[PDB]
Amino acid sequence: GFTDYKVADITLAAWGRRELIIAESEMPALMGLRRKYAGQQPLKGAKILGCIHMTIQTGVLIETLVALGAEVRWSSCNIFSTQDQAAAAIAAAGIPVFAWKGETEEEYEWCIEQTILKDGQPWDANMVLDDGGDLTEILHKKYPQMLERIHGITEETTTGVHRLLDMLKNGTLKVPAINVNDSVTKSKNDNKYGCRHSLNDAIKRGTDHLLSGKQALVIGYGDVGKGSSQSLRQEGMIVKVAEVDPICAMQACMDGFEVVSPYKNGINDGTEASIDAALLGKIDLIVTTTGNVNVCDANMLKALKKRAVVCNIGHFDNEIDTAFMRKNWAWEEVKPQVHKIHRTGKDGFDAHNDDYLILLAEGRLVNLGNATGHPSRIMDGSFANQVLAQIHLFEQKYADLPAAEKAKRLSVEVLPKKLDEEVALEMVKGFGGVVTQLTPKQAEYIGVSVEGPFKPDTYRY
Amino acid sequence: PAGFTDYKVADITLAAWGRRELIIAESEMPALMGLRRKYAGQQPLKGAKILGCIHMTIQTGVLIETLVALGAEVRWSSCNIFSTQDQAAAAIAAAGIPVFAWKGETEEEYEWCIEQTILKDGQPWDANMVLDDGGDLTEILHKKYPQMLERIHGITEETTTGVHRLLDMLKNGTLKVPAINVNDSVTKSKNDNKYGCRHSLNDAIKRGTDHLLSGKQALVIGYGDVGKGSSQSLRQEGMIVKVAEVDPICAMQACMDGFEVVSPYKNGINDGTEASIDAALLGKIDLIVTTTGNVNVCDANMLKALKKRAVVCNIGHFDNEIDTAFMRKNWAWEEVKPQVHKIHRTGKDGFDAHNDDYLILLAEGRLVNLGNATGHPSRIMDGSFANQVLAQIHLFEQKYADLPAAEKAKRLSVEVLPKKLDEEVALEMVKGFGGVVTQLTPKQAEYIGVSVEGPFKPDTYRY
Amino acid sequence: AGFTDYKVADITLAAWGRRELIIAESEMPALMGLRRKYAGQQPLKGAKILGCIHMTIQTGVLIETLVALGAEVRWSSCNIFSTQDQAAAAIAAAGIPVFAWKGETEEEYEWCIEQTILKDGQPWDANMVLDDGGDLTEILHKKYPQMLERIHGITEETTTGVHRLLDMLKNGTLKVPAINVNDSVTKSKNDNKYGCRHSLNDAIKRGTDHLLSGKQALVIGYGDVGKGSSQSLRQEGMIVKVAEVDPICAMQACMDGFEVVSPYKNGINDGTEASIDAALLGKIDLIVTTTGNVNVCDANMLKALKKRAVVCNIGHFDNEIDTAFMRKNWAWEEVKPQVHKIHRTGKDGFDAHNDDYLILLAEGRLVNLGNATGHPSRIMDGSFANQVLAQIHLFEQKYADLPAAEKAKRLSVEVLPKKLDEEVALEMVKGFGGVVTQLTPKQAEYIGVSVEGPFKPDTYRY
Amino acid sequence: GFTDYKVADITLAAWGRRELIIAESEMPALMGLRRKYAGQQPLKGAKILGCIHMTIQTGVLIETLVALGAEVRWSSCNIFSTQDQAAAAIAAAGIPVFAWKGETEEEYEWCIEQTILKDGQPWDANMVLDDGGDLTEILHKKYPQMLERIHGITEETTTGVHRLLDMLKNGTLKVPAINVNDSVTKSKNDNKYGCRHSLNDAIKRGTDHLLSGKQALVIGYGDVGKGSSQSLRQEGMIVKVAEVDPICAMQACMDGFEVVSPYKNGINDGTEASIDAALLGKIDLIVTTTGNVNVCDANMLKALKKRAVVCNIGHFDNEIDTAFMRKNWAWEEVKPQVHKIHRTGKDGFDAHNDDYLILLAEGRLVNLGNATGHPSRIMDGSFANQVLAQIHLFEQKYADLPAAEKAKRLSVEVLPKKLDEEVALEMVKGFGGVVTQLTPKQAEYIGVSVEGPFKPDTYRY
Ligand SMILES: NC(=O)c1ccc[n+]([C@@H]2O[C@H](COP(=O)([O-])OP(=O)(O)OC[C@H]3O[C@@H](n4cnc5c(N)ncnc54)[C@H](O)[C@@H]3O)[C@@H](O)[C@H]2O)c1
Ligand SMILES: NC(=O)c1ccc[n+]([C@@H]2O[C@H](COP(=O)([O-])OP(=O)(O)OC[C@H]3O[C@@H](n4cnc5c(N)ncnc54)[C@H](O)[C@@H]3O)[C@@H](O)[C@H]2O)c1
Ligand SMILES: NC(=O)c1ccc[n+]([C@@H]2O[C@H](COP(=O)([O-])OP(=O)(O)OC[C@H]3O[C@@H](n4cnc5c(N)ncnc54)[C@H](O)[C@@H]3O)[C@@H](O)[C@H]2O)c1
Ligand SMILES: NC(=O)c1ccc[n+]([C@@H]2O[C@H](COP(=O)([O-])OP(=O)(O)OC[C@H]3O[C@@H](n4cnc5c(N)ncnc54)[C@H](O)[C@@H]3O)[C@@H](O)[C@H]2O)c1
Ligand SMILES: Nc1ncnc2[nH]cnc12
Ligand SMILES: Nc1ncnc2[nH]cnc12
Ligand SMILES: [K+]
């Protein structure tokens, strides 16, 4: 008689379970943590509020936390990223989950609230797992008393880490956090190679457009921009890259990309005259990867080549000025998460109009919105880190400290390199890779232990 | 030429050719020439006396003349016996700059050349700055001329191996002057160490052997910055590349980058026995490249097990990555041409000229890109050497040797340049490609919590 | 008004299909240029075309181009899994007879072809054939030979179908001439190669969502499909090994940077388990067949494959993989449509948590069309512009109206002239925004060509 | 006391021989033919005039022909392509060779005539091996009586095949020829992959320029243009391709290149107004690959970005208008086969002038002029075909046949596919590749012999 959930269709659970069983075989680091810690139950007594894309991969994360002793209440961190069969399998296992693909904004907020409240009252949560900081922000702003019981937050992604660091700087962060993003087995695995796999995947599923031979503009060249540019270049696109960071721009040049700005002299003065119209008029596909606001702006959208594809793979949809397109242009749905935006006006459209753009997932995370996000074998790294971060903070019991001790303990830290290397070794073995063991003389020669860590903390890989 | 005799180079008559190539290189090095124009008037290195030890290439020539143009006097040697470009050395000597370097030095001559920079007219020069690549000059100063370090304000160290040696001295309390780790600027490590080897590894293998690489099997030992660039140098030519690593994080990157990760040893266990060698794997390898900065990562038993006619080379800083001593002791060497030897595994005394059981060793195991070609191209070295100039300016202006003891104790460290300067070097490199960097709006800068002028990333950022 | 001469999965998908056709038209400039160039001339007026080819959105644009040029058609798919149901619905809603849906049974597949051949229970007065793989051509020759007396020609899309035509020609059983559409360069070296480059990894991702980077693939074949397939996987970071029986194609694989291996020790396939390179196959995470041949992923290979390997076929017919052996001996667990786990533990049921299974895509049928949407519109533009030109040419030649003595002189399998191949290519290049340079008169004389082409001798291989 | 030769330096012979011994291990198809036919001596009595780049690879071909029974007299087919240590080794073996790197044009003709003449009179030659048609043309125009005794020509390269087909079309070809170029193990091996290996090799040796991140324009996308474009793209260049053949241009697009013209709308009207000056002003490297005339013309050279590199990898230097540059601009030699061309004027230059182009090999074949051309394991395919072609035409004995039988055989032909396959099989085994053998049922199913040929003659690979 379990009813503490809300999903699109519970009858998808058997399908979800079949895909979970396959996904476990693709996630050796995560499944390895089940075997290594199950006897010790390190999360016994943990009550975790979780807010992250309710995919099949997240299902294996959830059931790992539960297998190690935790109770959880779960929601997705995006309105389009849930896989309904994954949400169904989790609910059918008796786990509170509130998530479906295609939520409204109101339903999204309601879903997070259903994790926070149990039977109309605040749940006795003591841990937080977040992707983007939305759950973290709601707790700090609307339920601050609950944070007096919480031992820590483990944050998945670059945008959420920024929000944590803002609070730490302002002295408004109430509990310590682990920056899971900046494990190398996360940032340089998930953010880069994950988007390499899943960006062209989502574009093909949404449009079935040939990419070879066509012109792309990628805004940003951090980890997501690097992986996105490679996703397109390996398909044969001619990829140009925009950046505000000269070091990242240098990498794009050395990686074989032309570095350009949407704006003359790179100066974004807000006018149509600033736009390089010759450049924008040649672009078949624009992808935003920045975590910044309005990097594909109204004047760029006006200048784009007819029938260009526009999408965003950064965390939030304000990278693209979709508000401008809602106010001024008519949207024609092709199929779910694919809209033609007719630049002829707002008052309806000609079905045979040639002057439109194609927007994917309404500007939301395109790899999760139009496909299934990163593959299991990549998310294995990210989620093995999440499990270790949950154990790490839960075992330190910050919430039980007096205030003076809490102040000394309050931090936003990454996991130690030894754990990063432990995750990596399990990933490598999953590929059948064989790591070489240093001899004693060799370890002494380069100044490391045979067991690692093999690099100083300054190392960038 | 003229009364100036304070140099030793292979052939001073190569100077005009060297000057022609320097003028071309200047056009390829906008960050370095940007610093030359920016600081020429202020002469920030006026009074600096720099001992320099780094590959005497055309690129180093532009570095040397930038330091001199900013006011420094220098005395120079190469940090490798095979890396000098003789026309570069000739052009520098012809400019009146003391340089002791030629391609193909003996080990004794290599040491002599470093000492000729340290000594002027039989007595220590009044040096007050050090620029080093690998730590050889740093070590000679600390061991044999410790009194000279009393007047030296800092060391600017180019490469990973040299930085490791500096950090060991700092931990032991034996480092006498502060240093800047030039290697770990992003416009150095993630430009020079990676993309430089991408350009110059397959370059050197082609010049030495003219072997087709496409379709052949390679084993790259290591997947740090040099191993990453080296693996790409070979894969982009169509080699089937396998990668060995001891670091599981670097091994993970190799897998995701599309390489098979293997070990020369069964189950990765290097117990010193021949039985531990994966002979089936090594018997398929046409090319092995060492990239580690470690010792004996291509060992005797690996060399015995390699496929006949395999090429063996090293692109790490020191030749002890390969057990060439084993090969000198046991096998007959046949020089094909300079820096290319066939190593006949049939025995030590003489060889059959038509023997099929040989390996081809490049540069006698020394840095192959510089030994068999010309190292990294000017436009890549632009980044490394702009950082060197900025590092020399910073430490010279700090004047460590003149500070009170309490201030010395606070500044005796190994530091990197601030990220703002890394970004400023990068911006000039991007402009050199014709790239255009976008300026954040005030609102966008506020949104991500940076200044419009940068820095754009926290110091934790790995790029 | 009362149109019932069709059978599709769901007619209410038509509006969706029409939205996708309107998009595809903007992606197919060569085909739409033919529609615009020839519509007023109506060169296919009087043509009655039996068509058998994957009922995709791309085929919809082809169908409506033929109709726009004056043809009547009756259509079926050439594979049980390749139809896009919204494309079929849009074509039926346009009043065009189409019999096609995704997930046909073999009996339904044959019934659909027969529904194009028969109209109101009697042979339609067809006079042209468009085919992809030769199934319709075979049924006509075997079961409706009297209909071929009135047919002017066959335009055949794919390598396997052309092989079947040439077999009939050498045996003296081919009844009407054909155009080999496959061997236009804007077909074979566009569709067969780059199309599979686009759609192979596409279909694997949609079926399994497996990471491909870092994993080991074996591609059987290195012809045009094998070349494009190998690139589809290598560009994702797979470690790709290639098998071939043709030493020239094997040479290309080596030079392209692949290791060339055989499933069999020393390449010798003696039919025993002992001849299988068990060490090699035990490392393979994905095997793809691309040959047009029979049993190139055989029962002993399937027994030796690494646990949880993915098995798929992108050649025309499913007999490249011995799926019959898997049906007879192993238990099939459906993951979702066109994705099956095949449990090698036995035939009578399976442990839901068994680790010893293979993942088979599309039941061994063409995987790019079965698990995704096949080639993209802008690639199919080239193939289908060639189809329209081939239909025009054979229809205008009117073979069926010739005396028997003249039929014998005209009975052949031919390709389109290079000048038309070039004209298709030029529209494709313009579609990318590319600008082709024009020779000066002196340059044209220097290399011995006309300024307008053709630019290459017929021997040229590109 | 052998003195029937002319080389730069005979003392380089020991070095040349060391490199020949290495090269033999890289050339299994050619050395397999040497071992296979040694007993038969199929070229006994053959007297071959040879004209092809005097490289180490050509040295292995020469000694294979001699090992099969031929006498030869040899010259290079380009003034810059000889490797002097290869020529010296061949001369020190007692084989007449007239070739050095850096011949003048007058010396080039002298070397060919030295092969044609022995002791001041025409040699009793009966076979021709040519690369580009220069020797073929001299024989037809200056020594026509010698062709009465010659059984055939085996021609290496696309440009020479074109010249043979023009002669045949005009009725002026006096002896039959084999088009060696169009074996698949030549055209789609040598012409493509050879240039992939050796184009960026030569640019690096000449200039040591970084290529990654810079802009290249490749003129042509036939086999040489395909291989050249890959040579630059794999280094990270942003490569644009020009073509007059829309089918080749289509391939360029699908292969991920932008297709552009030096001329506005592709129309070359001979004036500066027709040049796309914006495009050419951004180009760092131009490579001509066409076999055509004046495809990098004077107006393009005027418009190129300052300090652009200019080079040609087609057979003849007239692809670039070097005559215009000799007439109008000042040439500064950097080093052999590397010249700065100062666009400031004819009489002298400023040593610090910034307005120059860098020309490689004076517009001659750049891979052979500034490096060593294709590697041994690629030339293995081409030169195995050469040996088979020489055997076939010499055994046919055209010069001995009565006139009507000559008329049946006066043609330009290719080698049979079976032989193409057998060459390829030896190349594959050289990589350690394992070709699978068809079962009898499989061979019947696709309609081939288990032994091949495996493809119809129409097949394009
Ligand atoms: N969709 C996914 O699966 C996924 C995965 C990981 C992260 N993310 C999200 O993607 C975003 C980027 O993550 P990241 O790790 O790459 O961050 P990052 O800091 O590594 O890179 C962002 C880059 O954007 C650049 N940038 C900022 N403003 C710009 C502008 N106006 N124009 C051009 N470039 C600009 C910055 O210089 C920086 O290099 C974040 O929102 C992160 O949460 C998404
Ligand atoms: N030739 C050049 O132009 C050039 C340029 C830069 C640096 N270097 C030199 O190259 C070397 C490598 O520099 P780097 O920056 O890449 O250093 P790095 O620390 O980034 O990488 C070295 C890698 O070797 C691996 N390794 C160590 N021992 C190993 C073993 N036994 N087997 C396999 N892998 C092993 C380490 O795990 C590490 O990832 C140093 O000596 C450096 O000074 C040469
Ligand atoms: N799925 C698609 O969209 C699509 C597209 C075009 C063609 N096709 C089909 O794919 C198949 C291949 O077509 P193609 O154009 O590449 O033909 P092809 O003749 O160019 O290539 C087939 C290759 O298979 C090789 N081969 C044959 N038997 C083999 C064996 N036992 N082991 C290894 N290699 C073997 C042959 O040597 C040949 O090179 C045909 O059935 C064709 O109709 C499919
Ligand atoms: N350097 C080498 O090692 C080497 C090797 C093989 C051949 N070659 C020579 O290279 C040349 C090309 O050989 P190929 O086999 O590639 O010939 P090809 O016929 O395959 O290709 C030449 C291409 O040039 C294109 N072209 C002609 N005029 C053009 C123009 N004005 N603008 C743009 N493109 C134009 C043609 O359309 C054609 O596709 C020949 O001279 C050949 O002898 C050199
Ligand atoms: N060309 C070069 N000059 C100096 N140091 C280098 N290190 C690598 N390449 C170099
Ligand atoms: N190395 C080489 N030898 C002879 N002819 C060639 N053509 C291209 N490269 C060559
Ligand atoms: K997924």
Ligand SMILES: [K+]
């Ligand atoms: K250099």
Ligand SMILES: [K+]
């Ligand atoms: K499609």
Ligand SMILES: [K+]
């Ligand atoms: K060569």
